[PDB]
Amino acid sequence: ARPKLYVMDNGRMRMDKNWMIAMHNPATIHNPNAQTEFVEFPIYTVLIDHPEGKILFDTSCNPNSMGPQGRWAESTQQMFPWTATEECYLHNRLEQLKVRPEDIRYVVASHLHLNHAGCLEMFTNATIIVHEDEFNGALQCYARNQKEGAYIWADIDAWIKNNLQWRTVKRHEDNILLAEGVKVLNFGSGHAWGMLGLHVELPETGGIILASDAIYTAESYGPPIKPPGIIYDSLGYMNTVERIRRIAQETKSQVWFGHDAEQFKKFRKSTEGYYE
Amino acid sequence: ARPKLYVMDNGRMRMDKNWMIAMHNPATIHNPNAQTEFVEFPIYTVLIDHPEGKILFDTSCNPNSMGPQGRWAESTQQMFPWTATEECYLHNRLEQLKVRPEDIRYVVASHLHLNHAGCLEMFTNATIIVHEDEFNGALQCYARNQKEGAYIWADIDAWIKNNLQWRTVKRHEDNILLAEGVKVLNFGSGHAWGMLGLHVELPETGGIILASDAIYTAESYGPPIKPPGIIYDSLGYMNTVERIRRIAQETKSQVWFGHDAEQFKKFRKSTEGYYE
Ligand SMILES: [Co+2]
Ligand SMILES: [Co+2]
Ligand SMILES: [Fe+3]
Ligand SMILES: [Fe+3]
């Protein structure tokens, strides 16, 4: 099999650095009112155009996320603003590749945060692969009518109204062979309730691990590991990072982080080409 | 049957509020360089003068902690400075109660952080009860010559040279009946590797739970729970806080937080009296 892997630029987001690197600049006797920064980071998706079928990793943010009539609560827009041009929208990025939503066989949701699950509702002909604990956690946010937070009620509303077809990865489920050289990695709890990664083995490029928010950046990866402020299971997070490190060394694979500005710049995006 | 419980003022410490309440004030589009604060909080120990023997909960900081020739590293001194008058020193606080180190039968170390295990070395005639995981973790810090962070090399050095007698609480060990109405609570991992609390049943005052850093403050306690930045096991931390809440409700016990300025102000300290 000779697949093509595309990195699609789905805009940028800004947030408190402390979210990304917990306690990045601690206050001191000499700096008692220490300042944080408001850092920019990429929101990207990955399309594996595979002969067995098209696989999508993450879905970025929903077009109608930001704004006065935005699905995102105002507090969320102010803490995690998403800047993107129309071309950065997933549906347009796919269109520029002559890929219709209906052509996606599999969507892998690393987690159900606002900036990874925004456009799940588009893929009504796909099987949405998600960690059961992540699914459960988001569904509770919905049921309890939680309007703030990283789980967008209106996005979840849409998933349900659009009758998405789900395939939950069970807590103790082995990695899933989705297609030749494409494995869903079950990272479990850490950054969120349930994280999924991808291991892709390309004939030419070789091995790629899509870590998503299991590893925000290279600063996160280290060594040493510098965990995020947005974390559900600190222990599981630490374990997941080391697990990823071990797999990378054993499979001689690259590790693609979730939101690393520097790494993203070096990527070949969908406007220039792909990875074989 | 008729004991007296003393609260001993062992000084004040300042640190970044983000340590106490994580992400207490996140940056926004309108406040991108959001400032943290450098808050003050109490360091205290608890003496249970019990007919079966004297029980000490926590040991505060070592007198030789701060300063150019201080045991604490400068970075630590600058991030977590301890201010204390001679009288605030535990040795002095005990002397004013006509209690010699040698008279302590049991020292319960909630955890082995610098602000709780400073003066363990004094109690050479006591049994030091500590969580095995906390003990293990600190001994690793020592063995690896970790000089910075919350585990003071020189402090641990002194514990070993002074030949302290340890009694480790095993990971899955039940609560320990230390004396009539005195009971060691095995909280396990959370704030640190292994946390111990006390439940004291006082004839007059009733039930008291000593939570130490299992719960920093009333703000931590909520509801809802607002976890700290100094955390090892987020899940365990959350579980512990809720376990304490339950025990408190079922035993109609007060919950004494580790570092709550407001609550401490209301405590009757060793200079004014005791709790029966
Ligand atoms: Co996320
Ligand atoms: Co502590
Ligand atoms: Fe993300
Ligand atoms: Fe403390």
Author numbering:
A (entry chain X), B (entry chain A): 8 to 283
Copied sentences from the primary study:
We provide the structural and biochemical analysis of the lactonase GcL (WP_017434252.1), isolated from the thermophilic bacteria Parageobacillus caldoxylosilyticus. GcL is a thermostable, highly proficient lactonase with broad substrate specificity (kcat/KM values range between 104 to 106 M–1 s–1) for substrates such as N-butyryl (C4) L-homoserine lactone (HSL) and N-decanoyl (C10)-HSL. The binuclear center, common to all MLLs, is coordinated by five histidine residues and two aspartic acid residues.
Asp122 is also conserved and is involved in coordinating the metal cation. To investigate the importance of these residues, we therefore substituted Tyr223 with phenylalanine and Asp122 with asparagine in GcL, eliminating their role in acid catalysis, and kinetically characterized the resulting GcL variants. The alterations in GcL activity may still suggest that this residue is important, but the interpretation of this effect is complicated by the clear role of this residue in metal coordination. This could be seen through crystallization, where multiple conformations were captured: one where both metals are present at high occupancy, exhibiting an active site configuration very similar to that of the wild-type enzyme; and a second form where the active site shows no bound β-metal (or bound with very low occupancy). In the case of the Asp122Asn variant, the Asp mechanism is no longer accessible due to the mutation of Asp122, leaving only the terminal hydroxide or concerted mechanisms as potential options. Curiously, in this variant, the activation free energy for the terminal hydroxide mechanism increases substantially, leaving the concerted mechanism as the only energetically plausible pathway with calculated activation free energies within 3 kcal mol–1 of the experimental data. Visual examination of our EVB trajectories indicates that during our simulations, the substituted N122 side chain interacts with and stabilizes the terminal hydroxide ion at the Michaelis complex, contributing to higher calculated activation free energies through reactant state stabilization.
